[PDB]
Amino acid sequence: MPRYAMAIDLSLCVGCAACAVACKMENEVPPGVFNLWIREREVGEYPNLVVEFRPEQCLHCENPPCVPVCPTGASYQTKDGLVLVDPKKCIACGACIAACPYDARYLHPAGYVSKCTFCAHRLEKGKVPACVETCPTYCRTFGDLEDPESPVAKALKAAERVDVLRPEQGTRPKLFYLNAPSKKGLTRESEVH
Amino acid sequence: MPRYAMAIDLSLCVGCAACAVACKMENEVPPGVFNLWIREREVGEYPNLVVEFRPEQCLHCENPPCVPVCPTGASYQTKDGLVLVDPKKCIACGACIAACPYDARYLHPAGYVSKCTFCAHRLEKGKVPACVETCPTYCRTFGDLEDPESPVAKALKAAERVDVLRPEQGTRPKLFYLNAPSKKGLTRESEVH
Amino acid sequence: AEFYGLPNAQEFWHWTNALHFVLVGLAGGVALLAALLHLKGDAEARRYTLYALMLIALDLFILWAESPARFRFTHIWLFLSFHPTSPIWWGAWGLGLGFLTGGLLYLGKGSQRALAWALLVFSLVALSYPGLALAVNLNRPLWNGLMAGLFPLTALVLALGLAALLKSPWALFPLRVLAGASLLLALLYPLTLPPEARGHLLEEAGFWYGLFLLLGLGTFWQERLAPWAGLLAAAGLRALLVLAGQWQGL
Amino acid sequence: AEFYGLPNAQEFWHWTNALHFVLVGLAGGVALLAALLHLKGDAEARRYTLYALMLIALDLFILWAESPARFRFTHIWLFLSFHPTSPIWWGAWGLGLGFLTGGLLYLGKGSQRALAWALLVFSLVALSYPGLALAVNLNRPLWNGLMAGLFPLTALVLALGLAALLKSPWALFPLRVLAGASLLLALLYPLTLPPEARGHLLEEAGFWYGLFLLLGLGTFWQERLAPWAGLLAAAGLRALLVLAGQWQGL
Amino acid sequence: APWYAQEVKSVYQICEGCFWRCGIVAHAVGNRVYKVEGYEANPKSRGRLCPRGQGAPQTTYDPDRLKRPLIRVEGSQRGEGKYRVATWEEALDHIAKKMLEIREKYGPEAIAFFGHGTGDYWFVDFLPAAWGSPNAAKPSVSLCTAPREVASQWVFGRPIGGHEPIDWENARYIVLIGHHIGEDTHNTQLQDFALALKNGAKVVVVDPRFSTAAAKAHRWLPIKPGTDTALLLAWIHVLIYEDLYDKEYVAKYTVGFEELKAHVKDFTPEWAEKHTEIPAQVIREVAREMAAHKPRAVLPPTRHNVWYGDDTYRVMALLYVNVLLGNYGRPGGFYIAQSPYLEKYPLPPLPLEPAAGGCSGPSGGDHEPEGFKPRADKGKFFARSTAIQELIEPMITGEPYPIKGLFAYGINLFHSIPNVPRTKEALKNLDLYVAIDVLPQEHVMWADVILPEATYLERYDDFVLVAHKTPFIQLRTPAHEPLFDTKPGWWIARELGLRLGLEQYFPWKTIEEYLETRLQSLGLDLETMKGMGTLVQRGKPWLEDWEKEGRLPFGTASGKIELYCQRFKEAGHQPLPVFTPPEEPPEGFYRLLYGRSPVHTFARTQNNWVLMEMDPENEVWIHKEEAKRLGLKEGDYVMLVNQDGVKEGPVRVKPTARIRKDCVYIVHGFGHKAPLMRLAHGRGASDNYLQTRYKLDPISGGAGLRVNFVRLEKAERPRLPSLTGLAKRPFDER
Ligand SMILES: Nc1nc2c(c(=O)[nH]1)N[C@H]1C(S)=C(S)[C@@H](COP(=O)(O)OP(=O)(O)OC[C@H]3O[C@@H](n4cnc5c(=O)[nH]c(N)nc54)[C@H](O)[C@@H]3O)O[C@H]1N2
Ligand SMILES: Nc1nc2c(c(=O)[nH]1)N[C@H]1C(S)=C(S)[C@@H](COP(=O)(O)OP(=O)(O)OC[C@H]3O[C@@H](n4cnc5c(=O)[nH]c(N)nc54)[C@H](O)[C@@H]3O)O[C@H]1N2
Ligand SMILES: Oc1c(Cl)c(Cl)c(Cl)c(Cl)c1Cl
Ligand SMILES: Oc1c(Cl)c(Cl)c(Cl)c(Cl)c1Cl
Ligand code: SF4
Ligand code: SF4
Ligand code: SF4
Ligand code: SF4
Ligand code: SF4
Ligand code: SF4
Ligand code: SF4
Ligand code: SF4
Ligand code: SF4
Ligand SMILES: [Mo]
Fold this sequence. Notes:
- Chain C contains nine helices and one strand; from the N terminus they run βααααααααα.
- Chain C is mainly alpha-helical.
- By secondary structure, chain E is an alpha/beta fold.
- A six-stranded mixed beta sheet of chain E has the order 21-23-22-27-20-24, with no helix packed on it. A five-stranded parallel beta sheet of chain E has the order 7-6-13-14-15, covered by helices on one side. Chain E has a four-stranded parallel beta sheet with strand order 10-9-8-12, with helices on one face.
- In chain E, α6 runs antiparallel to α9 (269-276) and α9 (269-276) crosses α10 (280-291).
- Chain E is globular, with a radius of gyration of 25 Å.
- At the A-D interface, β2 and α2 of A face β1 and α3 of D.
- β2 of chain B pairs antiparallel with β1 of chain C, so a sheet runs across the interface.
- Chains C, D: Menaquinone-7 1 binds at residue 129.
């Protein structure tokens, strides 16, 4: 009944990779694969140099292309907006990896697809995700989008600007980048070459 | 040698179609068609009500899809960045209309295709375009993008944010929108209902 | 939502053009039949060449009679320049040269197998350019890549459907193979679109679309309904995609 | 441009899932030959029905063999859930009901030639699903709408190529017709992509791409070159599009 | 082919697009103005122009534009549309003959003169007085500005004027009450408002509707309609009681500040929030923030003020807040506007001269024994201005004597005066009704004699003087000669003036003769005036410039803050307690709000193809949730029915939220029933045809319009001609 979301204030992100390492420890994510990673890009020339530190992970899209594509039904979207995988029905076919626009998904060495989970295991015991917990810069917030006392809700309200990766896709990403450092918005590789 | 562009401050635009009427008059654009129009869209409920006023017209794309697709060579891009039509070669096939992602062109009743000209007629004799001159609010700026002194260059340098329509086609528009009213950026019909 | 003035988002290609689209299909595909016939050395190669010439003439005549610049006489520029990136330019040269090539074939002058291979290549240019005249407009969500597949296969169902009404024995089998291909790709077409575009195709058309899909199934039933059904499905499908795909839409 | 950790942008369908793509082409294509040969009454309807059962079974083995989830036996769910939105789901049943149906037809029981109508339907589902399993991913620029057309055309080039090597009189001509349709759409494909997607395709594959296009031109020369040359072209293109399109790219 | 490559002739010319009268350059090629532009030196345009200014020239090249005089076929009813062409000579004789008859058995006061636009000087200010009728009026007085002009005359000794004196460029905090800037598209104030925003000017908008100006505001207060005086009184209370006001300023330039403090004792932000519906914290915060910025915090007074019957009180209160902030005459919001010096053309005094009243008896003293018959609306309200809407009754009942005969010089009888049925009864009963206009509107075709005026581009007009920081004088020169059988208003007035014994008035034989005399006075001639289109003179704007000279401006020597000892005495109340809870809409109904389209002027631009093509119809604004309970969606049409049963043609419904649930809003000027104006005929709903009733302001003659309620009834989409088809009719000067 709530709508779960994450917001990252890029004006404060320094791209130390604490959240990324906190995730790997908690969810014991295996070597070679990542639920969360950081992307750092410069937009250039001296008087006007800009560096964007951007953590990336499952955005738990509100209209996820990775769910419909699943033959088994292991890829499901929850009543509060988490996209999860039930490994019991997963046939490790990769259809969801093909349909995910963000590279958030991987094949776990135990034979099923995995990805960030919004720390489902903590959300039920009433705790905040591990990446949100460790953050030194206080730049990431979480909560129910519909509850206006939520740390995501209050941050979205305070942001000067709000962006999302590949909005042109169908998805409705529920991970919001707040104050993007470059005036043109979130950095893209086509805007370099 | 210059690279011609236009900048419109949306924080100042009030959608009084002055520019749209001035162009109609200056360029003798016949009745059922328009080189310039204003779109107005509201975003949101009671305590967060934003209204975006947006003039739309040829963006004189740097990578214009409306040029390669032309059979005759009527549709052409100038060395300074102007996209124009040599009516002497135009066969009114409508290929350029199919290819423009911005509804910027039309079939003029004289038998050829037309559209915003960046007032090439005034540019050549050292004047600024009709839309730019008649504008109570002073929200539009024009110039050579390469000259740090030109009014567009300055406007872009002083902007809080810069946006362009359908950036994901890869046309590289040369009509820049400054300081958009909504935190999420330029308004799209898809983010409605 | 509200405007002062209006964006120029109205239909630029009319019922008139959609007709040109059905015709150039016929034209091109009959020029392919005439080429392949001259190549087997079959006796019917002569009159199929007359027809491909007629349909080429009928198509250039309505391309010109429907042009807003029909009396400004600017089409000459189509032929005095080089625009390799433009489908319509390719189309003008394929048909045009394909009409000379097929002209000499008819008049037994300027060689004859070397002219039949030429007709073969120019008729592939003419069968190929329509789907690409649509498909290169990546801003129009309905004119996706399949248009480059749907248009060539459908131009063949038109030519073979015609050949079979004229009672040529070789064609009622290729007509069923190519009509099966066209109807399968036409049925999977909507499933290839982003949700909002499929929903737009279904609202604005479909019921017409779905009727053209059923229709074409009669190409596998009764012997003399088979070419009519195949002709009308292939032409209905071509015109419907041309009228319904002129949308930028968000 | 620089990362701490890495996006999971690694290839997800390897050379083994490119091999299955080629076999399900055959499996679905031959299952179509079989039902049509039934429906038509042909003496060969049996020979081809037991081939399609082997090709189908070979593929379903390669499908489980290459799955990292094999010894976890999770495939039973492929058959215990309803998931109409999923190309792969439709291919599990299309090849599963297509198997039973081909069994009840080879063991001459249950029912006759009302069952060849069901085999025809299931073979169309099996011919259609890969093509859409790629095209459904609108985030992959190379896997555009044409995949839904290039895969069914290419699966029949594979089935008719096999059929022609097992010297069936009927197979050569339709193989050279669908091979022409296949090769012409394959040529138009690059011209259908946006410039960055095409550039990616020509640097990653291409040669390989332009090789298999050239190679395929061999279906229109001699015999016992023909079925081979069209068969290597169809499987080249199929495997290369699965391999080169796993790009997300900006 | 393009006009700018073809030979051109420019001229300095005033825009008649609306009454702001911007200075413009007109570019003609032969007999046609292709382009018009603002110009730098001119203090109004400064190089820019609004949409209406840019499109204004097409009326001159409109195929339906009126060309010949016309006289009503004898025996045909006024309304029925039967006319026969006439000669200027014959039409002008017919009018004087008729006018003289009314004057021999009734007197000259039996002729009302209504008018608007530049040439209203001739028809409304000059001709009427030279003829002896006090029944001269314009809608910009009792249907617009009267409430604030009266409030201003009593509080300061000055007008607010046509170019309202706000020092926008130094303003730091601005409070707009119903003032919609960006929709109301007066050139210079758009420019200034935009420059204020630009320099970090934070703007507060009070309006029951989220307008364009609200779209640029730091705060939007969605006030319950007709409740602004309670919000103004509570702000007066916060600046006085929290002790935030400018102490010195009141001490040196203010009379009776004490009466105000005691009056406002109980009007607290909690008393206000109850009627206003704006939270009490917000009411407090807004007054504090404005006090923190003084003297550079301004509540500029809006122009259209007739809203409800109490109006002069709301403006008085708004002016007290400005006084309490110390901003009048200081850089921040009010500079002091002086009128330019251009000497009048020498003439005998006029039979009736005006009374620019404000104090010590400016009502009916000269109207009682003073010569022979007072303006016919003399006892209806306190103030002395003539009210257009009150002199209409005298034509139906013959009450205060009788008004047979009426002139309408460029004034929309059926769109600018409420209660259209009553106005039609009144035209029925008249002996003579003349209308001077350009297009065949619905009220021009009810006239005995229609006279076609020449348009602003084909005409010379007496100079335009503008009171300003730097007073200036503007001159308009023809861009080309009149078309068809068209004549300028100066010429039509003189021609009627010679026919009714007024030769001493109208002596000059030509307008350039007339213009050379006033230019002599200043030190120039006609050709030089044409050279520098506009003339700026030296004046004053602050209080220092006044003060150092040992003078102050006003009325009586110290702005009287409560504001007027002689109303108190014989009228009743001095202070603005009339917050007077407003009558509410009955259930099933909505209050009818109205306003401007950035691209259309009042009603007269609805046949303009360049402008109708930008905005072809109006659209009714209803809250999203109301249109939903009703069964209305985006593209639906609806009829508006008022509390009195009047229905207004099908209008498009506009279910997007930016409005309270109490209300509904439509742009004024659509709904024409005038078949001869082919592209304005049958489009949108007319607000005026729905404004059946009005609450008379008992202080400032104004007719409160926002007192009408309307309900929506589902209707069919309308079937109308194609606008492009009509817009394409070629213009032929025959
Ligand atoms: N119901 C309602 N009434 C209103 C208003 C409202 O919002 N609602 N607004 C009020 C206000 S604020 C004002 S200021 C007034 C304005 O009221 P008006 O000035 O009466 O308004 P318009 O509708 O422009 O009418 C102008 C008339 O003058 C004619 N005309 C235009 N140019 C010329 C010219 O050069 N010469 C001549 N002879 N005629 C010309 C036009 O054809 C038309 O007949 O109306 C007021 N009345
Ligand atoms: N484009 C264009 N511009 C013009 C004109 C034109 O014809 N066309 N005419 C000009 C003239 S002469 C005039 S008089 C003006 C008219 O324009 P204004 O002088 O600006 O008129 P207002 O009536 O103050 O403002 C209209 C706004 O008042 C609101 N309103 C209604 N009731 C209330 C209320 O009870 N309280 C509050 N706070 N607000 C309320 C409506 O919601 C609307 O948003 O514009 C002028 N400029
Ligand atoms: O077609 C299939 C593909 Cl591509 C994979 Cl990866 C799997 Cl596991 C299965 Cl079962 C089928 Cl049917
Ligand atoms: O295919 C064509 C189309 Cl669509 C047009 Cl509009 C024109 Cl003008 C020409 Cl010449 C050809 Cl070939
Ligand atoms: S903790 Fe914050 S700054 Fe560090 S990697 Fe995570 S998002 Fe970036
Ligand atoms: S890998 Fe697993 S979760 Fe992903 S689509 Fe296949 S079965 Fe579903
Ligand atoms: S980001 Fe990708 S993997 Fe995550 S929910 Fe969205 S589509 Fe699925
Ligand atoms: S929410 Fe949990 S699983 Fe997701 S990135 Fe944070 S710590 Fe990892
Ligand atoms: S003239 Fe200025 S305010 Fe008017 S539409 Fe153009 S940019 Fe906007
Ligand atoms: S319509 Fe004219 S400009 Fe456009 S592609 Fe055709 S010939 Fe070129
Ligand atoms: S805005 Fe239109 S005309 Fe201009 S370059 Fe882009 S597509 Fe071409
Ligand atoms: S720049 Fe030229 S074409 Fe563009 S709006 Fe202005 S006058 Fe029109
Ligand atoms: S404000 Fe606009 S319409 Fe009015 S006179 Fe000035 S330019 Fe003309
Ligand atoms: Mo007004």
